[PDB]
Design a protein around this ligand. Structure first.
Ligand SMILES: O[C@H](c1cc(C(F)(F)F)nc2c(C(F)(F)F)cccc12)[C@@H]1CCCCN1
Ligand SMILES: O[C@H](c1cc(C(F)(F)F)nc2c(C(F)(F)F)cccc12)[C@@H]1CCCCN1
Ligand SMILES: O[C@H](c1cc(C(F)(F)F)nc2c(C(F)(F)F)cccc12)[C@@H]1CCCCN1
Ligand SMILES: O[C@H](c1cc(C(F)(F)F)nc2c(C(F)(F)F)cccc12)[C@@H]1CCCCN1
Ligand SMILES: O[C@H](c1cc(C(F)(F)F)nc2c(C(F)(F)F)cccc12)[C@@H]1CCCCN1
Ligand SMILES: O[C@H](c1cc(C(F)(F)F)nc2c(C(F)(F)F)cccc12)[C@@H]1CCCCN1
Lengths: 173, 173, 173, 173, 173, 173
């Protein structure tokens, strides 16, 4: 079943790209403008938002998508260069894709977890002692996080299946 | 009368895609900025809006449209792969499209109902006791909800008609 | 003189599409942000705006344009399907176009009238008793309404002329 | 001189289209948000802005550009219809273009004049007695007005030159 | 070495177009929104901004780019018309391009100078007596001004070099 | 191993362009609107922001990308001109690309350093004495700065490898 796997992998990749490109930017548009803290201290909002969300989910996902697409670009550009052999570059491409996908999945888990809480406790200067801040659209962002994790897991499973189909001996040699 | 069924199904799909892509984003642009609650508590607006609208209608509809289009993408990519058999894949594609359409229709009904009320009663922290909040353009959103439900129902009916035309004994084998 | 009728109908259809697509969205951008009521009651602005403009003109016109274009899409897709009889489908397409255009013209008349007043009287909860609200750029919207009505009327006249040229007997059979 | 005339006319038309499409929308973006009146009366700003600028310059110019391009569209569509005589249609097209250009130039002069003043005196309800309002970017709008008038005048002159070259007797039809 | 002159001129023109189109609009987006005057007079901000920046740099540069591109469009349209002689039109096009570029460079210098100050002294009605206003991103705008002046100077030098590489006696005839 | 060098260089260039074009503008959208200083002095925010960020990172990076791409455009246009020799131009193109890349990397290091602090101390007129200002999303901008520096360093290394592969005696002649 080395063909159905490829079909599903291509479809899933296109699905992820389309979903992100269409809705992600809109979801995270008012992330800072609607972030509010219970305080009168100027600059507390900026510091607390920066501490709560060091990197927005959307930018992480864009970086992941481009990086995961990169090895296919390498293979295609090499194929173009060859004309005006290739059977070897394919295995390395698959291995690198596997490694990148697994790394990005683990990175997402360790960076963001599985949920976006509605409240945040912030004790960064210039905020006095500890203050409470309130997040915008926590539930939608939690749903997006879980959905992206699931799609990435499906991609990892399909890539591993293809790699196992290729075989240990071919990879090692 | 299966050919006219395909013609109408294609036209309805294109119509739904065009309507959503052109107006949906504009309709729901100020959903949170014009959402206001009668209170002085910081962060009550954010929590109450998140509780009232866990997932925006537009994002659900975009997800539904892409997911419903997915099986056709699978079939097309399989056909491309085969050249440089197909009669069987068509029935499975039709069945999966039917299932996805029915599931998304039921999900819309159970998530959103048939109307968007103008008032919302909210009792989520940090709001004190129970507060009243006011929604932005509820009537237009209700019209959009009903229209999308009707279009999805028409799509479901056409898909069922085509599947019945195929007959039970081809699906079984 | 059926040929000049077709030429003019195509030209006016393109003209309406271009005008709407280029200006309509910008005309109605600040419809709600610039809508203000003389009151201190939270939520009165939202309710009064929703009551005054249940559906924006621009969205009604977009729906009308797509719906009126739909029969041509049906005919074109049927023609594509036939290649890899047609004379009968043309008359049905013309009749359906006539009906849709007339229906949308009547609907516009009964929904919006011929003018957008600068003042609105609103007595919807939570507004206390009856309040006065002020509309954004009413004159431009009135001009747009009248222009769209005139263009739709011209389209109706041309469609009726073409249908009359076809003849009653052909329509019956 | 008939050839260089057409060359210049085409170049000038393209120039006008490009200038408007690129800068006009940006110039008139904050026309209402930056329009302020010296008053405390709710709704005075909206009424006075509507009175001062019943139709924005940009929308008038877009309408003029599309309407002036329409006769060429009619001629092109007629030519397409003929293939799968034309000498006659060209003269009528030129005459109609002349008439439309002259009409739009006169309309601009009578609607807007040659300058946008920085102050406006407004006595429309709900404003009490008479109030002073202040316009946004009056000088840039005046420059745009004069430039568009000059370009339209050049177009009118070129069209009249072409019409004269055609001759009275040929157009006597 | 005329050929490398053509390469350099073309690449410089493309570079200017790309830089302006990509960054200029974003640089001058908040020119008026972030313009502040130390006063309580309503309407003083509008008048002071209008007197300080009668025409935005970006619009002047767009006008310059389109105008300097125009003669090439004239030449290309003439060439297209010729098929379904040319060696002569080219020198006139070169001369006109050179004159236009020099004129726009001189106009830039005489209209904006070489710097954008952070402070402005405004003395225009309705501002009481003399007021002080503060500009948005003066340093970035100064850098943009100097860069555009340098690019235009390079274009002027290359145009003169091309004109000389042709020679005086062909220009005379 | 010069071919893999070219493959990697092309892929890295495309990667940088895509990342910047997709996320950079959104990262720096609210750089000035969310910049706040602890003061009551009008115009202090503008002056302090202008002093802290004379040129935005995004515009510097756009300029760098276009400038680094320029030599390839020169080579391509020269090749186009030659048809309706080239071996020499390639070496000069490579040398100029190397010089531009190194210069832009050094310029970035000397202009911005390796971090964006969350606090800024500002003593520019009209601010009284010395005030404290707070930056918007400093952490994301720090990450972007470091990532761009790393990508530019990789490009420099690949360019140096290719230039060394060409060797000194070819460059000298
Ligand atoms: O410009 C934005 C965008 C473009 C593109 C691309 F150029 F690759 F097609 N990719 C995007 C992505 C990406 F696909 F993950 F790369 C995410 C978010 C916005 C994207 C989108 C495009 C759709 C409409 C909203 N902005
Ligand atoms: O980028 C937005 C958008 C694009 C596209 C797509 F790229 F697939 F064509 N699909 C959209 C959809 C759709 F449902 F996926 F079709 C919904 C809302 C906005 C969409 C729209 C496009 C029209 C102008 C407003 N933004
Ligand atoms: O995306 C918007 C838009 C697109 C399109 C379409 F995709 F069919 F071409 N149709 C639009 C329509 C139309 F009526 F469907 F033609 C109305 C308003 C905006 C439209 C416009 C397009 C021009 C620039 C402003 N947004
Ligand atoms: O969508 C807007 C627009 C488009 C077009 C068209 F689709 F015909 F090319 N024409 C426009 C016009 C024009 F006059 F019809 F040319 C004016 C203003 C904006 C226009 C512009 C396009 C350039 C970027 C800013 N919006
Ligand atoms: O619509 C804007 C724009 C377009 C164009 C054109 F249509 F000719 F390609 N030219 C622009 C110019 C230019 F100088 F005419 F090239 C300047 C500024 C913005 C421009 C840009 C295009 C890139 C993305 C930001 N808006
Ligand atoms: O118009 C913006 C943009 C365009 C382009 C170009 F026209 F060259 F492709 N280049 C951009 C660049 C680039 F560095 F020049 F590539 C940076 C930031 C935004 C860019 C982007 C394009 C993708 C969607 C968001 N705006």
């Amino acid at each position: 079943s080395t063909m159905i796997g490829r079909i599903l992998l291509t479809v899933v990749v296109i699905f992820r790209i389309l979903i992100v490109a269409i809705v992600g930017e809109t979801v995270y548009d008012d992330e800072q403008t609607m972030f509010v803290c219970n305080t009168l201290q100027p600059g507390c909002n900026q510091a607390c938002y920066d501490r709560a969300f060091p990197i927005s989910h959307i930018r992480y996902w864009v970086f992941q998508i481009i990086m995961v697409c990169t090895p296919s670009l390498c293979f295609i550009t090499y194929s173009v260069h060859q004309s005006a052999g290739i059977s070897r570059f394919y295995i390395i491409q698959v291995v690198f894709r596997n490694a990148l996908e697994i790394g990005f999945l683990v990175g997402q888990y360790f960076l963001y977890g599985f949920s976006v809480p509605g409240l945040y406790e912030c004790n960064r200067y210039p905020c006095i002692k500890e203050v409470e801040c309130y997040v915008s659209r926590p539930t939608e962002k939690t749903v997006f996080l879980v959905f992206m994790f699931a799609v990435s897991g499906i991609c990892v499973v399909l890539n591993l299946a293809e790699l196992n189909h290729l075989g240990w001996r071919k990879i090692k040699l």
